[PDB]
Symmetry: C3
Subunit: 605 residues, 3 copies
């Protein structure tokens, strides 16, 4: 007769549970603990890197442009038969007694060349001292001077050749590279001797490819400016090497101080040293890097030419404290040195707040414990350290915040059990069915709960009695409707009344005193049945009623994917191209010349 | 007699609480609010970088190979006494009237060299014009031409010398670098003048190291191809510089347009400008970068030679809109220019959706507000920007999703209080003990709760009466068992009955009407006691019963650690090595020659 | 009379709800599902990169220093008129019959130069064979030998010139670059022929710029050491190219094996191949990189000179398995080759655990499915791959852990509904007011809930009756206080008693049997009212009572912002500077010489 309007649901008959099946709620579980926070040491650090810069210094070249042209005289013209150009090494004595001394040069070259002592007279006249004037102007140039301007050629009248001599002096830039046993000039000439060669200290062990009299060292030299004529106010030690083609002078200075194989790279006001995994971590918050190192300091003794390290190390460390923690913190021992992957040498100065000044004694002892010739190689890319630093910092948070939640969760559950405990006491069925993940019947046998599964009844095989007032015992009116049903389609018809959430209770025992304005709704099928004044009215669907929710919401979204495409500022080729001249490309073209423009096989007779 | 089988637990006696101790549940707390979302401006952007590429252009060299050999004649052989090679600067007039004009050269050189006007006749014959033929073949070469192939040497019959002259013309590649006041050829020769030198416009202020008649500028030049003989269809302005060793010609073109000190680097269809921390952010989603900048635009006026910037800037910006937002969006003003860390110049075109077209007026005003000679230096690494971009994007999510949860949590708690409120009303003890984190006794004094701590009773000092049926008042049967106990080992024996979770209630007041099939379980010690038909049966352990849980699970795992090792494609050395010839290495070896193979000290007599 | 002491709150009158308004709790929602985990293939991989290294090999130069000086004799001095230096190509026959054969050279040069067969006699004496002695010492040098030490100059007695001849032999280093059709020496001389030129195999198709008799190839050559005199134990194929200035010999070896255009870069013991988005992913956990590729293998056939690839590919792959999975896993087919963005060629060997050995047949078929002249260009930066790898790994976790929580949340809610269901049954008002987010009145009409909003009553317009014992029916004593009030300020005074949380119930129906020690607290205003023995005592504030909480706590903090500043080890300039000599800088200075020190315009007569 009155069948379910909404069929998108199920019905259940839950017969009383015997001691057949009984379960117990799990007890509160043990909660995880926030990890003991990492301990960080404050400290200052300076980071050094393989020094790739060459040694630089000033030098002065003295030499002579010795030219000899030969000329054939045509009836109405002239033709060079030859033009011989050479370089004469102005000698020690002329550089001291003539040039430096008075600012003049002789007009004559006299040197060895191919094992013979040749000699050139300017214009082939008697020797004549000539004042040196600055070279002509030119953008981007060291200083320079010369005596002669033009070239002297023989007249038709006449020594069938013409000789020219131009005394030249330049303040070239010198550059040398490790091992620094030879150096180079601005002109492109090598000089096969150490820039630190000399007679003072152990400097005489330095390298040299030349005989002893080539080299000479004036001890107490006041050079005078060739433009201002001024005299040096302080003396130096002037070195003078005389090669076959020139005499080169610079100021000798002690080696060790002058150079270094590592380069101070960065200053980190707040470098943090963490201890983990049998290694150290040096996170520079500002620089966004984290260096990894053994727990053993590095022997600066093992370093080849590293005087500058501790020099700068202290300077920066002394200078930094004086500004940042001049009175904020206190040093904990002496600077220390560690070598990180990437070949970065970290000098570290462990700090300590005035707050925990009590801990000084202990700390100190654990720092001095770390205290125990070759070159260090440095990678070009610091990327891995910034990755490390980055990844670590994020991982840290993620884990931290997440951990905290895992706990907040656990605890929450433990407590909520105090709520399910009493709740099952109320509707053992509701609670039970929501614990076994299925519809069951259950009752309380003391402190445990007995259960028994329910049987699904067809949605078609359920019918609602039309009234709710008992004819037999008037003055009484049930509170829950009555129904009929069959577990099978062709099956018999069973009596019983309705219960919460489509439970077809067999025994019709629920009744209340009859009343007026007694209208109710009942969970019937996929919707509700509407009874008014203890008598049926009509059916509905859940859609007809305004919903409210018991769930706090949460809109979690995924961090979506992202592709990192190859991206580069300057490609390799751009860089190569960034050089105005290319030796290789040119050489290749230069040496092709006679192949493209001549004939290198034919033999004439 | 009947003692606890499972001893891994505790018992408690909770005596009624007086007004001595009373507490109140905390009220719902104030929840945090989702931060006002960041506002992003849509826009197009082009990124420029310090231009490191040299200026390139085509040039043509004209010069002459002037050779003079001298030969001694042996009885049965011949030996060169000398071989003098030089370069003659074909002069302006010959390049215009002979070469370019007819495709021929003279067989004679006539130039200044060492302040004398020498002259060479090919084979020392009368002057003779000679057609230029292409140079021989060679892989990877500019074009070239010449008149002569072989070298003329004197016979034993005879001017005791032989003269050769080969007119050479090459279409070399020229390259110049900022400040562009001088340039270089493909052969390796410098030319100390600006490629933009000339007589037109302000070009005459350009640089030059040569006298005025060296340089000449034909205004209206139709060059003819030396291979195809074709004549140029359009005239140019042919420059011609005549150096001591050659005459070099190229086409003068105005400077400013021709060059630039910044290089268009990338085009970003969707560049996003965010405003934060007194700076801007330019995230290129595609390129995975984020640039940081002041909120003030950059003066392109301040830029040295940046004509190309706005040139390309517009081009790309006009071209991009036309494709992407041709009708999707609308421009919001004129392109703007900002300078980011790393020295990347960002030209930006703020966009706007047709949707919010109403906001045009306001936006425009806030963009025009930003509108207000030196070179910009660019880092080689864009890594920090990709790190920035990366880190920012992840941080964003993390914070966002996490924030949302913190709230969902708060709210959840607030509501659940409506559940604890009523629950304590049920089992004030259970709820109380789970709020003070310890076992206590409590009752409800109106709206507050009175409490009093419980006393722990030894697990050994507890005993269960064997029956549950009162002899005095048969027909009645308690619902909770009875027990005995002592707070001390040597202590007296106290009477009382059992309660939920090992509570030893002193007063034995819980009783129910006697029934059949009345079996129950009771929380006794580390397990349960089993009573059947109001009479003891046996004890158990919680292990014997199937557990169900009231906790929703969560399997949170840590993001584990990871080490980023130094990783590099090409090391520094590999790069250096990538050059076929090494000037330094060679020079070093070349200049050693006379040290290894001769004797540079001995003087013969 | 007795008004609220604490006014920081509100009062409400909740009149019974009719069927006017009725709502329903939302049903449990459908929960999201953990995504099907990504399937990863185990495998070994080797990564190759554009080979930028030049080809290297050893070579030997044989040539002669032919010098001719001319000397004028002064009365008391001597002057070089000229010094002509040249290089003579020791010929094939002399290198085989004299030098290599006996370790001696002739004292005479005889070669073509400028199309004439000149000849030099050492000191102009009869020919004389001379043993070659090692060159002098010099740090960092290939081997070398020579016959002569000094230079022979003419005496005043006399052929008015002096001739010198020094036979030179050096074991130079050779270098060639793709296309490898020409190579270079350590001295700086080009040799325009392929290092792989010869007569064997197809080698004769190799390049050459020289006539056929220049080149000669001895098939079966036992070179003898010029220092140890030892003879080679095994013969080679000695090549000998005779250029105009020297004869250069090396050992011919087949091309293809000798070179390669890609360079084995890294070995990845555990490379993981993921399949996604129509592409592959190759995450190297160790190297912290992830490569992206099409799902189609790459044709090694398409590779120009890649013999070495598969050579090394197998070697590493065979060598690795043998160590790691020698018996742990099993190979799944033949090595495969893919090309990733960045131009990295990935050779991959899919693996498989002995565990799932059953799946072999299927897998194999899906791998062989992927199996199907130009050079590959490689970026210099691997950063994007490490970013990819990094970002992906973090994203993975975040999403994963978060997803899990979203679920744990959903479920939690669904269940808790079983708790709100029964709770509303208890205090329909409390529960209702905490579901509509506002204070309302509600009752249960069967399975739905009827509601009706409450009316706010002024905090000023509320008053508490002083007693709680009814005079009319003594022996009885209400459980809840009584009050008076007005909805308006000037309004009438309404009777009614107090309820939970400031609800002003109109009907005074709550009463209990009178008792002693009957003290209670009541939620009155911003605090409590204290009644003792059914008679008023005093008021309080919530501050006076010790609070306990029903909320599990959670301290979520934000991951804070961080700025990644431009950071670089060596700048671009530092790198450029890292070269001891700079061809460009020098050339620029060299070619300026005659501008600064002479006069290149004046013509003398
Ligand atoms: C921090 O210091 C304490 C005291 O030495 C130590 O026990 C603890 O292990 C440290 N924290 C961590 C994360 O190791
Ligand atoms: C640390 O010691 C290990 C030996 O276990 C060595 O391999 C490594 O080179 C050292 N690391 C540093 C950076 O000192
Ligand atoms: C969840 O949040 C995202 C933004 O992260 C938003 O796009 C989406 O509309 C939100 N979902 C709902 C149903 O509000
Ligand atoms: C977005 O725009 C509104 C309106 O100007 C502004 O008030 C708000 O601050 C902006 N959002 C953020 C994150 O600042
Ligand atoms: C922005 O202005 C600051 C001054 O506060 C200056 O130091 C910085 O160079 C400027 N940044 C950029 C990228 O314009
Ligand atoms: C938790 O998840 C991880 C994978 O992230 C898994 O390895 C582990 O077995 C899980 N724990 C349990 C108990 O399921
Ligand atoms: C893993 O393998 C199964 C079986 O082929 C497949 O159905 C599933 O899609 C794979 N997992 C993922 C993430 O695709
Ligand atoms: C893959 O194929 C696409 C065509 O859709 C092509 O553009 C790309 O170059 C290929 N990628 C690789 C790395 O092979
Ligand atoms: C929350 O945790 C942070 C550390 O992440 C801490 O600084 C802060 O004090 C904590 N808040 C409280 C109230 O404990
Ligand atoms: O004068 C051009 C000549 O020096 C060539 O060898 C340049 O490559
Ligand atoms: O002929 C070799 C000679 O030029 C050397 O100086 C090369 O280093
Ligand atoms: O002797 C110096 C001369 O060679 C210059 O051209 C160097 O730049």
């Amino acid at each position: 007769d009155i069948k379910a309007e909404n069929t998108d649901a199920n019905f259940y008959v839950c017969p009383p549970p015997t001691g057949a099946t009984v379960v117990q709620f799990e007890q509160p579980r043990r909660c995880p603990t926030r990890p003991e926070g990492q301990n960080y040491t404050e400290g200052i650090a300076v980071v050094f890197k393989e020094n790739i810069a060459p040694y630089k210094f000033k030098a002065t070249m003295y030499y002579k442009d010795v030219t000899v042209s030969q000329v054939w005289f045509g009836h109405r013209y002239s033709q060079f038969m030859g033009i011989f150009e050479d370089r004469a090494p102005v000698p020690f004595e002329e550089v001291i007694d003539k040039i430096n001394a008075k600012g003049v040069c002789r007009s004559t070259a006299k040197y060895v060349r191919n094992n013979l002592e040749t000699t050139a007279f300017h214009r082939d006249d008697h020797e004549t001292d000539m004042e040196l004037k600055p070279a002509n102007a030119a953008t981007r140039t060291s200083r320079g001077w010369h005596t002669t301007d033009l070239k002297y050629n023989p007249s038709r009248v006449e020594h069938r050749y013409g000789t020219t001599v131009n005394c030249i002096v330049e303040e070239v830039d010198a550059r040398s590279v490790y091992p620094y046993d030879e150096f180079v000039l601005a002109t492109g000439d090598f000089v096969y001797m150490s820039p630190f060669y000399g007679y003072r200290e152990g400097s005489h062990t330095e390298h040299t490819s030349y005989a002893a009299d080539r080299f000479k060292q004036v001890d107490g030299f006041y050079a005078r400016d060739l433009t201002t004529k001024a005299r040096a106010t302080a003396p130096t030690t002037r070195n003078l090497l005389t090669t076959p083609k020139f005499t080169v002078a610079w100021d000798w200075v002690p080696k060790r101080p002058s150079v270094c194989t590592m380069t101070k790279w960065q200053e980190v006001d707040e470098m943090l040293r963490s201890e983990y995994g049998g290694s150290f971590r040096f996170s520079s918050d500002a620089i966004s890097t984290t260096f990894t190192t053994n727990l053993t300091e590095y022997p600066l003794s093992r370093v080849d030419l590293g005087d500058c390290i501790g020099k700068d190390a202290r300077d920066a460390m002394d200078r930094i404290f004086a500004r940042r923690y001049n009175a904020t913190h206190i040093k904990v021992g002496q600077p220390q040195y560690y070598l990180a992957n990437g070949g970065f040498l970290i000098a570290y100065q462990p700090l300590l707040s005035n707050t925990l000044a009590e801990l000084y004694v202990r700390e100190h002892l654990r720092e001095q414990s770390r205290k125990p010739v070759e070159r260090i190689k440095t990678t070009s890319s610091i990327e891995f350290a910034r990755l490390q630093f980055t990844y670590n910092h994020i991982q840290r948070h993620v884990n931290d915040m997440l951990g905290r939640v895992a706990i907040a969760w656990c605890e929450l559950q433990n407590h909520e059990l105090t709520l399910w405990n009493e709740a099952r006491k109320l509707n053992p069925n509701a609670i039970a069915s929501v614990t076994v993940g299925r519809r069951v019947s259950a009752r309380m046998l003391g402190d445990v709960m007995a259960v028994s599964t329910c049987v699904p009844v067809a949605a078609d095989n359920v019918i609602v009695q039309n009234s709710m007032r008992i004819s037999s015992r008037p003055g009484a009116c049930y509170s829950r409707p009555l129904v009929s049903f069959r577990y099978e389609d062709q099956g018999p018809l069973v009596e019983g009344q309705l219960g919460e959430n489509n439970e077809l209770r067999l025994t019709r025992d629920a009744i209340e005193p009859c009343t007026v304005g007694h209208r109710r709704y009942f969970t019937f099928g996929g919707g509700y049945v509407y009874f008014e004044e203890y008598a049926y009215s009509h059916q509905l669907s859940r859609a007809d009623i305004t919903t409210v929710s018991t769930f706090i919401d949460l809109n979690i979204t995924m961090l979506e994917d992202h592709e990192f495409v190859p991206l580069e500022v300057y490609t390799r080729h751009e860089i190569k191209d960034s050089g105005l001249l290319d030796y290789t490309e040119v050489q290749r073209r230069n040496q092709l010349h006679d192949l493209r423009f001549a004939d290198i096989d034919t033999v004439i007779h």
